């Protein structure tokens, strides 16, 4: 029955990290009295922890923003290729945002070029699409949410070559349509472009805030 106790605390650790927060510590032993033939176990902890503060912000790598708008599908130093069997090109741009404190630069191509036809303001024959899938009940949490589906005058895209093989290095290009056409179709319910319909959503549940729900 010998009562053990703590000895002297050792040297404190220096702050491990060069940015932000870290943790320093001190180590003590139960070496001077020592519990012999039983007793207790020195009463407490052989380890203290402490937070150290370097007060300097940390590297954060930049992240890509979303891609911009596609450029028009025209040719440089020419005119336009609207409503014509001429494949062109168009470009798109990104922006690296958020890079601070010697962080890593954004990895990848900041530009994007793809091949295109042009149906910008092109009068195209059209046909009414079938009923779209029912949308979301809007407004969520607001008074009387309603869904919405719609039929729209879908243009008949012209039967062009979707794959255009260029020479030089024999590069074949997946060509996709660009532009807002002018779809021509017969009226359905007094409307030429889009006729929709709304229906109210049944048995709407109340929105309860998850931090207000846990508490």
């Amino acid at each position, epitope marked *: 029955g010998v009562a053990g106790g703590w000895g002297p605390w*050792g*040297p404190v*650790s*220096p702050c*491990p*990290v060069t940015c932000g*927060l*870290g*943790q*320093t*510590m001190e*180590q003590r*032993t139960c070496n001077h009295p020592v519990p012999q033939h039983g007793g207790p176990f020195c009463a407490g902890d*052989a*380890t203290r*922890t402490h937070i150290c503060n370097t007060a300097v912000p940390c590297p954060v790598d930049g992240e890509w923003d979303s891609w911009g708008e596609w450029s028009p599908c025209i040719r440089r130093n020419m005119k336009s290729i609207s409503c014509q069997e001429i494949p062109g090109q168009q470009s798109r741009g990104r922006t690296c945002r958020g890079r601070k404190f010697d962080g890593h630069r954004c990895a990848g191509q900041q530009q994007d070029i793809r091949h295109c036809y042009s149906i910008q303001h092109c009068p195209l024959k059209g046909s009414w699409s079938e009923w779209s899938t029912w949308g979301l009940c809007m407004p969520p949490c607001g008074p009387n949410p309603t869904r919405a589906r719609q039929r729209l005058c879908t243009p008949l895209l012209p039967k062009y070559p979707p794959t255009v093989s260029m020479v030089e290095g024999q590069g074949e290009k997946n060509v996709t349509f660009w532009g807002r056409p002018l779809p021509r179709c017969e009226e359905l319910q007094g409307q030429k472009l889009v006729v929709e319909e709304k229906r109210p959503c049944l048995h709407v549940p109340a929105c309860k805030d998850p931090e207000e729900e846990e508490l």
Partner: nanobody
Amino acid sequence: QVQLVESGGGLVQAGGSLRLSCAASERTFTIYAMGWFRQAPGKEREFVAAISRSGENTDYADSVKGRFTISRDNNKNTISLQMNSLKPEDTAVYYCAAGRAILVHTTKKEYDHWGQGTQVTVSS
């Protein structure tokens, strides 16, 4: 930044015991979480044991749990690996490793500082 020196290896009979020690740089010792690795002939390097900066939290590989014990002496800038019931499959070059840990109770498996190694050979 930190240098690591292993010691205690040698030739042991099967079932015997061996105690390795790893000396690290004195001024930066309590900053780094530390551990033991080994690399057998013809095999990749594998995790053996880890210890936090505290010496209070340990982690072990399943192949050595119950046989090996990692300890830390924060008075004398050393860690130790007490290897009991040694088998011929434990023959490897044993490496001491050091790794930066933000918390003092965190055990790591990824380390960016490595010693030169100590040879442990177990004969049947």
